[PDB]
Design brief:
Chain B: Belongs to the fungal fatty acid synthetase subunit beta family. The structure is cut from a larger assembly and holds chains A and B. Chain A is largely without helices or strands. Chain A is built from 1 helix and no strands. Chain B is built from 1 helix and 4 strands; from the N terminus they run ββββα. The radius of gyration of chain B is 14 Å and the shape is elongated. The chains are: A little secondary structure, B mainly beta.
Chain lengths: 49, 66
Amino acid sequence: NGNSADAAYAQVEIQPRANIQLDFPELKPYKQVKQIAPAELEGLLDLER
Amino acid sequence: LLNKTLTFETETEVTFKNANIFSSVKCFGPIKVELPTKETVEIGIVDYEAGASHGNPVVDFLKRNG
C-alpha cells in the first residue's frame, strides 16, 4: 500500500518556544476588589500620600 | 524448521494498472530445505496472490531476512 496509507497518518508535533513574560500583576474585576477592603475606605485615603 | 537452511525458488507474475501500481501480483514456487548431504528437497510452497499493490512483499521479506 506504499507511502499514501502510512504518510497521511504520521501526525505533526509542536515543540514550544519561550514566550518570556514581564509578570505584571493580575487586576481583578472591581466587584471582586471591593470584597477585600472595607466599604468605608472609598474616599478616605489621600492617595497623594 | 530449527537450525535448517531454507531456499525460496520464486517466480512472480504481475499485471499492471499504471507504471507504478500492479492490478494483480502472484508469487509462487517451492521452498526447499538443505539436507546433511547438501542436496535440497521440497518441503513447502509460496502462494502469495493480491489485487492492487505497489510491490511484491515476498521478495522484500527475503531480501532483508535472507
